[PDB]
Amino acid sequence: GWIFGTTLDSKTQSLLIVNNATNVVIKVCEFQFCNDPFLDVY
Amino acid sequence: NYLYRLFRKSKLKPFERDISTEIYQAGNKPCNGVAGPNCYSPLQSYGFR
Numbered sequence A: 001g002w003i004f005g006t007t008l009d010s011k012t013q014s015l016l017i018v019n020n021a022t023n024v025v026i027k028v029c030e031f032q033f034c035n036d037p038f039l040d041v042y
Numbered sequence B: 001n002y003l004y005r006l007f008r009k010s011k012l013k014p015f016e017r018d019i020s021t022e023i024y025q026a027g028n029k030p031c032n033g034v035a036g037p038n039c040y041s042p043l044q045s046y047g048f049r
Helices: none
Strands: A001-005 A012-017 B003-007 B043-047
Touching: none
Parallel strands: none
Antiparallel strands: A001 A012, B003 B043
């Protein structure tokens, strides 16, 4: 996880570069409602 | 339907998209959504007559 941003705020801009042991190396456009998407392998 | 910014902070580098904006404080007046004195929205429509 390499969450970037300019203020780390819901209104302003942010990025959510994430990585794992599989093909989920997805770089989403703008995710801000999730406070902490940690390891959720359950 | 077309919006441009009248004024802003210090100037841009090449190729920024700055679609997020709320308000500018032109003084000590806490408007935060009021179109009164010392507070204005940056977005303002062309009209294109």
